[PDB]
Design a protein around this ligand. Structure first.
Ligand code: 8NM
Length: 108
């Protein structure tokens, strides 16, 4: 699984790339519930996730395989779709970033 984890690190680096920043930036770090004033975020989202946490987990070798890495990336997008109304701008941004992830993750 060392080779598939190098691919996971490559995919995450691509998600942080300048060419995707216009839609990736809300996912770079944890949702700051207090600063944003997000009503009941912690009641609705039991397992928050973001790209910096995923990066820290890859560096600490916490994912034993590609499936575990992919589960955290999809959790990050799922939390966004779950919390927000479907018409929210952040949801449209999550979909664009998920295009990047799914298309590369499938080429594992
Ligand atoms: C994942 N996410 C993130 C934000 C969000 C986060 C931060 N900065 S941060 C990472 O918290 O430090 C800044 C703005 C944010 O809002 C917008 C981002 C773009 C367009 C409209 C809203 C958010 C807000 C409500 N829902 C969400 C959500 O689900």
């Amino acid at each position: 699984h060392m080779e598939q984890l190098k691919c996971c690190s490559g995919i995450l680096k691509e998600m942080f790339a300048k060419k995707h920043a216009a839609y990736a930036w809300p996912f770079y770090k944890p949702v700051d519930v207090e600063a944003l004033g997000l009503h009941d975020y912690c009641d609705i989202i039991k397992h928050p996730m973001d790209m910096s946490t995923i990066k820290s987990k890859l560096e600490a070798r916490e994912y034993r395989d590609a499936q575990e890495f992919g589960a955290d990336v999809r959790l990050m997008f799922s939390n966004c779709y779950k919390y927000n109304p479907p018409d929210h701008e952040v949801v449209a941004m999550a979909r664009k970033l998920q295009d990047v992830f799914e298309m590369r993750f499938a080429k594992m």
